[PDB]
Amino acid sequence: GYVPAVVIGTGYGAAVSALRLGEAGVQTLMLEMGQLWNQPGPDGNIFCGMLNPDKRSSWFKNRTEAPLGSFLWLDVVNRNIDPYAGVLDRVNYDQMSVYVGRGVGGGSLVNGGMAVEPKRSYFEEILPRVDSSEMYDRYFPRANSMLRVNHIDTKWFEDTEWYKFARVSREQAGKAGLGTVFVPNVYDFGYMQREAAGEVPKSALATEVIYGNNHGKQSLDKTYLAAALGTGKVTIQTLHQVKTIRQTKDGGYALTVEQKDTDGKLLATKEISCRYLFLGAGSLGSTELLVRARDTGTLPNLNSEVGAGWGPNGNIMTARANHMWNPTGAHQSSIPALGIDAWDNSDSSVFAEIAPMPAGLETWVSLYLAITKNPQRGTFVYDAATDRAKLNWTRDQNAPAVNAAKALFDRINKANGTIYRYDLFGTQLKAFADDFCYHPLGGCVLGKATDDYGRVAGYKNLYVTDGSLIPGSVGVNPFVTITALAERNVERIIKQDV
Numbered sequence: 001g002y003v004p005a006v007v008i009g010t011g012y013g014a015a016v017s018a019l020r021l022g023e024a025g026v027q028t029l030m031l032e033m034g035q036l037w038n039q040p041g042p043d044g045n046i047f048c049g050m051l052n053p054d055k056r057s058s059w060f061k062n063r064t065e066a067p068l069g070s071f072l073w074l075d076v077v078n079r080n081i082d083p084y085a086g087v088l089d090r091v092n093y094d095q096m097s098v099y100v101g102r103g104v105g106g107g108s109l110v111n112g113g114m115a116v117e118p119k120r121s122y123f124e125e126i127l128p129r130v131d132s133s134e135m136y137d138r139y140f141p142r143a144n145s146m147l148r149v150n151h152i153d154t155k156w157f158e159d160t161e162w163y164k165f166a167r168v169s170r171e172q173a174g175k176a177g178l179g180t181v182f183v184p185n186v187y188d189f190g191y192m193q194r195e196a197a198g199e200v201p202k203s204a205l206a207t208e209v210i211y212g213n214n215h216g217k218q219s220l221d222k223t224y225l226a227a228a229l230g231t232g233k234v235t236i237q238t239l240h241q242v243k244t245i246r247q248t249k250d251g252g253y254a255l256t257v258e259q260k261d262t263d264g265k266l267l268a269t270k271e272i273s274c275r276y277l278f279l280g281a282g283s284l285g286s287t288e289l290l291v292r293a294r295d296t297g298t299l300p301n302l303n304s305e306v307g308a309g310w311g312p313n314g315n316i317m318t319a320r321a322n323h324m325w326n327p328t329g330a331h332q333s334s335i336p337a338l339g340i341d342a343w344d345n346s347d348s349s350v351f352a353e354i355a356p357m358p359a360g361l362e363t364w365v366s367l368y369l370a371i372t373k374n375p376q377r378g379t380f381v382y383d384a385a386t387d388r389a390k391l392n393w394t395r396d397q398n399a400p401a402v403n404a405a406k407a408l409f410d411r412i413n414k415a416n417g418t419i420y421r422y423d424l425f426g427t428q429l430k431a432f433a434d435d436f437c438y439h440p441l442g443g444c445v446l447g448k449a450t451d452d453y454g455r456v457a458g459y460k461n462l463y464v465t466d467g468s469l470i471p472g473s474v475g476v477n478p479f480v481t482i483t484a485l486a487e488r489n490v491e492r493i494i495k496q497d498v
């Protein structure tokens with residue numbers, strides 16, 4: 001039936017939009033293809049950890065996988081599983097694999113919690129049509145507050161065994177003349193201190209993050225979505241996937257929506273219509289809906305920029321072998337706390353986080369997630385045969401990202417007399433993982449496929465709210481930018497359109 005506003009998805013763009021719609025008195029239905037994660041599983045916990053993966057770890061896969069970088073230690077805990085509506089989806093394209101969350105809260109369920117504002121000078125470079133003053137003076141602070149961003153206690157950080165891995169990379173980087181920065185987070189650092197003291201159930205300190213955190217992490221279900229539900233004007237239907245979007249004759253929108261069970265069985269297909277339609281299905285999901293609608297003729301006035309301008313936020317993973325006198329520890333918090341900021345807006349830029357590893361014994365490995373400035377972009381192209389948007393990205397398109405990461409870490413190796421690991425990402429000698437993405441950005445770029453507030457070009461009352469708006473790169477972990485941009489956009493849309 002009819003609802004005034006529909007929001008597709010329940011990640012960052014969706015959650016901001018639904019809160020503000022509800023507060024404005026607009027009855028809003030959110031449609032989420034994954035589960036509401038609130039039922040204890042066979043171990044009494046909602047989520048599996050990285051040492052005990054099961055069907056809850058994976059969106060419709062028949063075997064668990066090791067976290068990237070840890071196959072050598074964690075393949076031993078992999079098991080065959082039933083295909084199930086689990087929390088983490090590795091989406092495989094021809095030469096790129098994109099990780100995304102599936103559930104009420106989207107990627108906030110599975111992410112590292114790192115809550116970082118981009119450098120203003122870079123924001124100005126990537127989005128020159130947007131007023132940076134309101135973003136930095138109003139919308140970024142609003143987002144940080146609503147998200148419950150907090151900061152690690154520096155004395156605790158210095159002293160705790162759980163961050164030895166971070167201190168080791170800080171020392172090594174320092175010998176190359178590179179400093180580090182603390183990374184704010186939505187994981188409660190006070191709670192984390194009490195975990196280490198044995199006072200509360202462990203999560204970050206029990207090898208949990210990418211399949212969810214049973215404690216500590218303030219995912220969107222606790223923050224924006226709880227507040228949205230609190231307005232009395234927002235409902236969320238789960239295991240409901242939107243498949244098609246059309247314009248009705250009077251200028252509203254109608255959706256076909258499949259309801260499934262957790263085994264993936266089709267229970268029903270529903271029609272849902274609305275006056276205002278907000279896409280928050282992610283870089284992958286929003287872009288797929290729109291390229292499908294254009295190229296199957298249901299939204300024929302979508303422009304040629306729909307699908308274009310995708311990038312992986314320059315994501316590259318690499319690792320260094322430490323000297324035997326610099327062990328990283330058997331006990332590593334699953335939430336990063338430190339990064340190396342070598343980002344100057346040039347093509348050599350790197351913002352690297354010092355990533356923990358879950359093995360739980362000493363390996364001497366330092367792991368890094370590098371964020372780089374690589375101008376290469378991919379395009380999502382609709383395949384009518386399989387009814388899927390295919391990403392056309394090739395691995396050689398990540399060569400500039402690898403080059404920038406390698407230049408930075410070569411400096412660190414030279415200053416320390418260390419070498420890379422070459423064996424963490426498969427049997428072939430490979431020091432730089434260059435075909436994964438945690439931070440997909442673009443496909444429906446702000447000001448290209450949409451106006452400067454995410455209004456889809458060619459259509460009225462049709463909006464995109466999420467990572468698909470961002471032009472391929474933000475130079476830092478992206479969710480704070482997605483949240484702040486969504487605050488700006490929905491506020492303007494409500495004022496002028498609703």
Ligand SMILES: Cc1cc2c(cc1C)N(S(=O)(=O)O)[C@@H]1C(=O)NC(=O)N=C1N2C[C@H](O)[C@H](O)[C@H](O)COP(=O)(O)OP(=O)(O)OC[C@H]1O[C@@H](n2cnc3c(N)ncnc32)[C@H](O)[C@@H]1O
Pocket residue numbers: 008009010011012013014031032033034099100101102103104105106107108110111112113114115116210240241242243280281282283285286289438439440466467468476477478479480482
């Ligand atoms: C997978 C992953 C991601 C991250 C990280 C680790 C890992 C392991 N870590 S780090 O450590 O790597 O850095 C990050 C971190 O600490 N900090 C950060 O800023 N971002 C991190 N990301 C990235 C962010 O999580 C990401 O940028 C945001 O979540 C993107 O937000 P948004 O663009 O709003 O989308 P979403 O993916 O959260 O949510 C989309 C939702 O829509 C659902 N959905 C999709 N299509 C739908 C459809 N057709 N019908 C109905 N529902 C439909 C999805 O199921 C989902 O819930």
